[PDB]
Ligand binder design. Sequence first.
Ligand SMILES: NC(=O)c1ccc[n+]([C@@H]2O[C@H](COP(=O)([O-])OP(=O)(O)OC[C@H]3O[C@@H](n4cnc5c(N)ncnc54)[C@H](O)[C@@H]3O)[C@@H](O)[C@H]2O)c1
Ligand SMILES: NC(=O)c1ccc[n+]([C@@H]2O[C@H](COP(=O)([O-])OP(=O)(O)OC[C@H]3O[C@@H](n4cnc5c(N)ncnc54)[C@H](O)[C@@H]3O)[C@@H](O)[C@H]2O)c1
Ligand SMILES: NC(=O)c1ccc[n+]([C@@H]2O[C@H](COP(=O)([O-])OP(=O)(O)OC[C@H]3O[C@@H](n4cnc5c(N)ncnc54)[C@H](O)[C@@H]3O)[C@@H](O)[C@H]2O)c1
Ligand SMILES: NC(=O)c1ccc[n+]([C@@H]2O[C@H](COP(=O)([O-])OP(=O)(O)OC[C@H]3O[C@@H](n4cnc5c(N)ncnc54)[C@H](O)[C@@H]3O)[C@@H](O)[C@H]2O)c1
Lengths: 334, 334, 334, 334
Amino acid sequence: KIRIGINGFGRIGRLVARVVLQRDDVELVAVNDPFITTEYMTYMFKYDSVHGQWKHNELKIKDEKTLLFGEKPVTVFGIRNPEDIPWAEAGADYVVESTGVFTDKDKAAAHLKGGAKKVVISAPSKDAPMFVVGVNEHEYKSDLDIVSNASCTTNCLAPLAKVINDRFGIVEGLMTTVHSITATQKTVDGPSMKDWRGGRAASFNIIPSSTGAAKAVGKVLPALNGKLTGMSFRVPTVDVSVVDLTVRLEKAATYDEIKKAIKEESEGKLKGILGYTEDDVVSTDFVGDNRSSIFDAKAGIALSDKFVKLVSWYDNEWGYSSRVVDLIVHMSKA
Amino acid sequence: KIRIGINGFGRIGRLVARVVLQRDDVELVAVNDPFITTEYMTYMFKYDSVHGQWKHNELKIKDEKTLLFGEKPVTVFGIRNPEDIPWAEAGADYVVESTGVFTDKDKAAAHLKGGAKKVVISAPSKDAPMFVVGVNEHEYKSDLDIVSNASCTTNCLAPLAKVINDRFGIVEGLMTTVHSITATQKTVDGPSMKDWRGGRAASFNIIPSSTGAAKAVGKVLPALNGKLTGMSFRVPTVDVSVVDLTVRLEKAATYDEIKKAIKEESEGKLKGILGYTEDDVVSTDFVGDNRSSIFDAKAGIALSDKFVKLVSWYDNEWGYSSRVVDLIVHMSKA
Amino acid sequence: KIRIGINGFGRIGRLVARVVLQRDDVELVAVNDPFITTEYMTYMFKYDSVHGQWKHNELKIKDEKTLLFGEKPVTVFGIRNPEDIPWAEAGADYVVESTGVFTDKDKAAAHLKGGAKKVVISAPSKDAPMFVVGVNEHEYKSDLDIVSNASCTTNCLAPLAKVINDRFGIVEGLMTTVHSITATQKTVDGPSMKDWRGGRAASFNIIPSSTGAAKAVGKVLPALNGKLTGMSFRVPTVDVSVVDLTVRLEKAATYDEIKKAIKEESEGKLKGILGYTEDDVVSTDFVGDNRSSIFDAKAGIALSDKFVKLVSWYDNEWGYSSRVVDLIVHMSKA
Amino acid sequence: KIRIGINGFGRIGRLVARVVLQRDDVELVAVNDPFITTEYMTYMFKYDSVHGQWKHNELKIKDEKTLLFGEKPVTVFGIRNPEDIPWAEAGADYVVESTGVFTDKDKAAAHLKGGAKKVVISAPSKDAPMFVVGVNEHEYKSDLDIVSNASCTTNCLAPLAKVINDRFGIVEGLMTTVHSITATQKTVDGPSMKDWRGGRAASFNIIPSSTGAAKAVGKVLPALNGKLTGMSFRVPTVDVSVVDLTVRLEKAATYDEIKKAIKEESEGKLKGILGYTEDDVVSTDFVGDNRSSIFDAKAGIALSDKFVKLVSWYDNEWGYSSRVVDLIVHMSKA
Ligand SMILES: NC(=O)c1ccc[n+]([C@@H]2O[C@H](COP(=O)([O-])OP(=O)(O)OC[C@H]3O[C@@H](n4cnc5c(N)ncnc54)[C@H](O)[C@@H]3O)[C@@H](O)[C@H]2O)c1
Ligand SMILES: NC(=O)c1ccc[n+]([C@@H]2O[C@H](COP(=O)([O-])OP(=O)(O)OC[C@H]3O[C@@H](n4cnc5c(N)ncnc54)[C@H](O)[C@@H]3O)[C@@H](O)[C@H]2O)c1
Ligand SMILES: NC(=O)c1ccc[n+]([C@@H]2O[C@H](COP(=O)([O-])OP(=O)(O)OC[C@H]3O[C@@H](n4cnc5c(N)ncnc54)[C@H](O)[C@@H]3O)[C@@H](O)[C@H]2O)c1
Ligand SMILES: NC(=O)c1ccc[n+]([C@@H]2O[C@H](COP(=O)([O-])OP(=O)(O)OC[C@H]3O[C@@H](n4cnc5c(N)ncnc54)[C@H](O)[C@@H]3O)[C@@H](O)[C@H]2O)c1
């Protein structure tokens, strides 16, 4: 009951694996990563520069095919092709497309040929529909072959967008995300035909980067379709990011009004997805924080009562993996 | 003709000194820093982690009182009290208040007792009037005892604000500044009663910080008095910062229109103060860039034709020192 | 009945507090830091950039003076002078001198005037005797008023010195310590007449620094008095450091022989002080690892069977606080 | 008549290009990098995070194929296979193998099929002979098709080895190199079966790494063949590295004796290859310092007069490119 395999033992792959292993609702059946060998998988999973050493179970048994997590066998695949993954063989019904390349619906439906039942993109997708848990997750329908969990930025912005829009009405917004570095960036000035600035040495540079979570909100909250856009700056932190959201409002609201509205929703419908703090926090204070988005009351500032800048933290690695699992489970029920 | 002494051989002190020494319009007579010894001043000036080794002149002669820069004697003071600095003794007519503590007009006018003629704050000041070269520098009057050159953020924002306001009209704006770390921050989690988040380890943290350059623009551009405010994030770069400015407009304007208007002003009145680039730049590309503010055309993004987010780079250390000197010279003439 | 007060709520202060509060054999009675107020102590102790948010119970009760660690009393002092702390007129019998300035025996014995019974320096001391737990801790005598727990680096080197000297005999050694940055360093090139290179921007520099733990080992292990010395390089990590020790040996020994001897001692007499790993570890893999020293078998290399370079990790922050408490406890058992 | 093409526009490619273009005894004919397009080469060469914007003349002319360094021809190739470069059917007589993959003599001699006359490896090579300029460069012979300039670390260690061995005799040595990060490392914990610790987040870790330059010194200095070995620690600096060398000596020598010998050789035969400083330097103080090796007198420390630890800085990027060109030139003089 609820059987999971991961295609791509990346950062998100491994962290989703951590989360799954700790949960009782789910099992972890198999994993596919051609670029890592089984024995190397044991190392990569145990030791972690951001989220600490793993402090439960684990070992490794079968030559090249399986590991033992305490007493739980997990089957290992290193198969470049995405169909020749024998899903369902290892009874993996849900797949986590965590590779970052197969993020088209077209492209993601290669695992079903392998025998898998449902595939979840750990990333946004042009074609595959998008679901931010806490906002539109209920709009899931039980026949949806393929699906996307959007992006960290989307999963941080969309709940805050929802609360603010509902309570006071969003006219226009522009969003910046001061964001940590990621696997796609480069340690030293290097080639990046895709984004010329993305190749520059990530850890000693502020890097203008292109997001798109703000328009992707429209896709997960059609009310706001076309009323938001924004940009990113990658800066030299290893993890944790934050959203700076600048919005014009339909209905007037003082700063305390919007703060208290967010405290309300953080206690009500959005307990566990949208948090709320009034403390002198910083990025490290959110490493291993399973919330999608946390409102920072002391950080933000308002200009009018129709114009306001709002700040929300989010652990791009941990929050997003948590939400991925949450989404899998909502699917398993619905 | 134009004789300069520096009270506070900080980062800005030393860099203003670099700039002055390279200029022919100005002489560098004396310096006061109780926390550095003469011989240590030679080291601190030569070697520099951001702006490279010094590649002209320099040496050191008189026990504790003076140095020789090629063949130019500079008198050394290490006097905690700010009046017991014998300005005018060493014929220092202009003073650079670069300490960061005496930034009140009241407090800055201690050097005149020493015998100095005029004092320039390398920082904003509540009481002492403010001048951003390129915007309001002409509003200087020849009887102004004390004066302030505002802040790096102000010197980056105000020219961009001016161009945009003049061409299209600013209704409302909120500004964020992704900013490098500074002497006030701390290497490791430490005490900072003034700003609790400012004490947290600066180099491995994103740190919400409080600016005020956006309201200080009103003081240097009264047209916009009260129509802007914003915030800062200190991130782990050693130098160079950037402004993200989100504005509502009176008069419609496409992105190319505002880009070309800024290219215009960068060629016209604001050659040398406001630059303009359409290249895939990053923070390091602006170390040792004497401009106050550089428009980044590829980075910015617009939502409507009345709502737009604009990005401008600035070397908080070098640009500001350049402007400080520029201001001294405009004063010397006017 | 073990009652402890901390003079100096620094990094070592706060972390020693973590360690004490979590263990049950010891209690934390009072704390003194003039530069931090009670509520600021609550913040600084709760949130931590290296060792995470604190995962037990604590807050603050009375309009200053006292704090509450789950309905229990911690008295707060902000008294700049080091006596006049009512250590006895409150209940603090053991004191942790964690300020970093009072490290003379003479000056450390100011807390006794306050009424405290015994004082432990969280640092080496010229005059006050030194104890590395796991090596010489037993030579303590029950009448010794004041005492020092040496240095983070000493506590990493000394157990390895003991094992190697005992099993094979050390002829000569020179040790390097690639060490993380600390509170004494500077975020940007700044004044530090004490160590001229220490003022240079800590986070963007390799910085030659001078230790003295290696000759100080003789002071806690007279067998090798004068047989070692070395140096440090400070590098831009937040915490965790490592010792590289280059030794000539009396009795020949292959690398695996030395590995097996260290594994033995790590399992035997030196369980918990000296660890042992044959894994592809890195600095972060030791954040919050209370061992004094961890031998890295794969990293080291031998030239002959008398000439060998040995590598040992240590969390300069966590290991040392653990040892400080451990030592207090060994003392209590008269 | 010295015509050079670069296979691999990496860090070493681009920087060698800087060096060649600035000097007049050599010309730059063509360049090959399949993963970069012409205009992207213009960007990548112009802007640089370590060595600043380029301060001469350059841009691009023809719809790819060729570039212009001030009305002069540079032919552009993007040819993945290493022959089929019309090195001769263009004009490139010397080739810089800067890709990092073709470092076998066998595989490096693919450019000769393209028509090139001589090939220099920007890296050590199993089979292809090795030359450290300033030590063994003269043993080159005019018929040697293919060749290697060793490693950044080799070129720092070997001259110091020469001076110390010659003046006092090296019995045994073990060397550590606290080394900056490089393109091979990873921004976040990532896959690298080659060096398991090398995949760990490069910018937030001390990373044990294995060099081999120290035994490779024997290969370019047979006097000491088998008399040295060592290791590396990669730390989060962008560039500049340092060698820590621990040696036992045949003939006694006080520290100042060794200082004076190295100062001598730095003034005499080894001007420009081996420098000498008695100043409180740090890594950044050597960014863009074309010397192979700089002795740091204040940093080092001696135990006896036969046992001593010696420290030498080197810009792994700039020094090595300088040496590569220098070597090409020494070759041209048959
Ligand atoms: N890292 C984050 O903070 C983050 C947050 C949210 C979403 N995401 C999304 O997750 C995806 C990957 O991100 P990441 O940070 O894990 O990158 P990553 O490099 O750490 O992970 C990619 C992993 O996939 C593996 N892989 C490559 N090709 C494969 C194949 N064909 N079959 C199976 N495995 C393969 C690689 O070994 C690699 O480890 C991207 O789409 C990204 O947008 C990342
Ligand atoms: N550093 C920047 O990027 C930057 C940019 C713009 C403006 N500023 C302003 O410059 C001021 C200082 O900034 P900084 O970065 O140079 O800080 P800093 O710490 O580097 O400089 C302060 C210097 O003043 C010296 N000093 C302290 N007390 C003194 C005294 N009483 N008399 C003479 N000298 C004394 C200290 O030795 C120190 O070196 C602040 O007001 C800051 O707002 C800084
Ligand atoms: N940081 C490390 O990795 C580490 C490791 C081993 C040893 N040590 C030693 O610990 C000592 C402090 O190190 P740290 O990292 O905690 O430095 P720190 O600056 O973080 O701690 C010093 C604390 O003492 C407080 N203090 C200053 N003056 C005081 C006074 N007169 N009375 C009471 N409190 C006062 C300050 O508020 C400060 O918080 C140093 O001697 C250092 O050598 C530190
Ligand atoms: N980086 C240093 O500090 C340094 C110092 C000494 C030696 N080296 C050596 O230099 C070599 C490369 O180092 P780097 O830092 O320049 O790495 P790099 O990745 O920056 O450079 C390699 C370049 O070669 C290009 N390339 C890859 N395949 C190619 C192909 N088949 N044909 C033509 N070009 C191709 C790539 O585009 C890349 O830009 C390595 O062997 C390294 O050991 C580097």
